[PDB]
Amino acid sequence: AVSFIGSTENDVGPSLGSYSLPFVYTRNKIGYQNANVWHISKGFCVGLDGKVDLPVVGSLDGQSIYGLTEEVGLLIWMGDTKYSRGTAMSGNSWENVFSGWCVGANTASTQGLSVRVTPVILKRNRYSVQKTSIGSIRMRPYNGSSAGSVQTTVNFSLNPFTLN
Ligand SMILES: CC(=O)N[C@@H]1[C@@H](O)[C@H](O)[C@@H](CO)O[C@H]1O
């Protein structure tokens, strides 16, 4: 079985956090993590797809730099719960960010996710960014499992932050 147990709207990073061309700035500080977004059981197989809606203004080592303002951009990761499992995002299409797993035929667990970003200074003049929509992540059932009657997609918004 599968049930949606998380939240539809999720904030990335602590609200109004401060961090000290182009040049990259934050580890896992600017992120959102939730190990329990869906409850799964009895053989349910699930992975995750991710999509970034921000405009791509460039790229660094194979991944897109998404634009926020003239001065600030972002490198973005989406994936399974643990931050080190994040998949570098490029473009604006749905991408496989977690290959997936199957819970035991006679057991239950949960499926989580994480979104992480790192600031990128595009233009220099402190830099402040306001709450901005980043994109979404949708569960990807496989092996015959069904999204059935469950919310498959959740959204992410970047909390306001300041770069010194
Ligand atoms: C409570 C918990 O930690 N649940 C995790 C879940 O967040 C994760 O998405 C999944 C696949 O790695 O493995 C579960 O054990």
UniProtKB/Swiss-Prot annotation:
Belongs to the fimbrial protein family. It is found in: Fimbrium. This is F17a-G fimbrial adhesin. Essential fimbrial adhesion factor that mediates binding to N-acetylglucosamine-containing receptors in the host intestinal microvilli, leading to colonization of the intestinal tissue, and diarrhea or septicemia. Also confers adhesiveness to laminin and basement membranes. A carbohydrate binds at residues 35-36, 80-81, 109-112. Disulfide bonds join 45-102. Residues 1-164 are annotated as: Receptor-binding lectin domain. It comes from the Bacteria.
